[PDB]
Design an enzyme around this catalytic site. Sequence first.
Site, PDB file in Angstrom:
ATOM      1  N   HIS A 198       0.843  -1.195   0.000  1.00 44.95           N
ATOM      2  CA  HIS A 198       0.000   0.000   0.000  1.00 44.95           C
ATOM      3  C   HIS A 198       0.882   1.250   0.000  1.00 44.95           C
ATOM      4  CE1 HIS A 198       0.225  -0.414   4.427  1.00 44.95           C
ATOM      5  NE2 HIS A 198       0.332   0.878   4.376  1.00 44.95           N
TER       6      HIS A 198
ATOM      7  N   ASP B 266      -0.056  -7.515   0.645  1.00 43.88           N
ATOM      8  CA  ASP B 266       0.300  -6.156   0.997  1.00 43.88           C
ATOM      9  C   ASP B 266       1.835  -6.142   1.085  1.00 43.88           C
ATOM     10  OD1 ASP B 266       0.453  -3.510   1.523  1.00 43.88           O
ATOM     11  OD2 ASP B 266      -0.757  -3.603   3.398  1.00 43.88           O
TER      12      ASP B 266
ATOM     13  N   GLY C 205       2.558   5.799   9.779  1.00 42.57           N
ATOM     14  CA  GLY C 205       4.001   5.954   9.483  1.00 42.57           C
ATOM     15  C   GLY C 205       4.797   4.661   9.695  1.00 42.57           C
TER      16      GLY C 205
ATOM     17  N   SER D  60       3.707   1.732   8.753  1.00 39.06           N
ATOM     18  CA  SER D  60       3.430   0.872   7.593  1.00 39.06           C
ATOM     19  C   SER D  60       4.736   0.396   6.930  1.00 39.06           C
ATOM     20  CB  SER D  60       2.697   1.511   6.393  1.00 39.06           C
ATOM     21  OG  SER D  60       1.341   1.359   6.778  1.00 39.06           O
TER      22      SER D  60
ATOM     23  N   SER E  89       1.144  -4.093   7.970  1.00 33.98           N
ATOM     24  CA  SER E  89       0.221  -3.582   6.968  1.00 33.98           C
ATOM     25  C   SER E  89      -0.805  -2.628   7.563  1.00 33.98           C
ATOM     26  CB  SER E  89      -0.481  -4.759   6.369  1.00 33.98           C
ATOM     27  OG  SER E  89      -1.708  -4.540   5.664  1.00 33.98           O
TER      28      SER E  89
END
Lengths: 185, 51
Positions: free
Chosen positions: A33, A63, A139, A141, A156
């Site tokens: 993502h 992801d 942040g 991620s 994710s």
Amino acid sequence: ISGGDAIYSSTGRCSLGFNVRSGSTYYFLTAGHCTDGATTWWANSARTTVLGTTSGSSFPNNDYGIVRYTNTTIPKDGTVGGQDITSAANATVGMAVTRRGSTTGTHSGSVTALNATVNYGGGDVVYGMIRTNVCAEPGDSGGPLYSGTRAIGLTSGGSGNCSSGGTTFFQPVTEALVAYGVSVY
Amino acid sequence: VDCSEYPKPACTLEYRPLCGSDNKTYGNKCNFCNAVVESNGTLTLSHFGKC
């Protein structure tokens, strides 16, 4: 730069998951993502140090994304912060894991379930996810989930926060390694 | 920003912040819209970017 450090694309900031390589070509994995739609990645908010360009991105459904390094001299360490990662493993229920991310730093907990489906809305549903009781916030991620010197996942998404407790889901890293033919070092 | 399809049981965690009317920087639209719902509509968006 190592696992957990911030990464910036044109739209925002994520975290570097793990430094990986195939032959002599280095890359880094992060969340799909974060890779969706980004082409260049930099190591600072001012965008002055280039890291590389996106080479692959799989989101939704899975992801994970990978970025190939074009910056020849930045140090690409095989660690997460300074913990070394020497191999990859599959998550199991009850495993103690630790995550590192660019907003919250390092936080630990355990895997509570495997194969969960998380629907982030608008058709973005991801499947096959590791659930844990580790918190994570915006942040974080794409940062790494590891156990010891074992790479296990990439952050994710989730709910809650680190002050009050939360639940975070991670993409199993073995799957990304095998989709791109790369390996941790 | 429209929070009509919220809430959402989970959010992706990229950071693209927004500033709420309670002066808190929301780290992304998913987190900001889940808090608008949790406040039963009383929080609004002040401006884009950190507060």
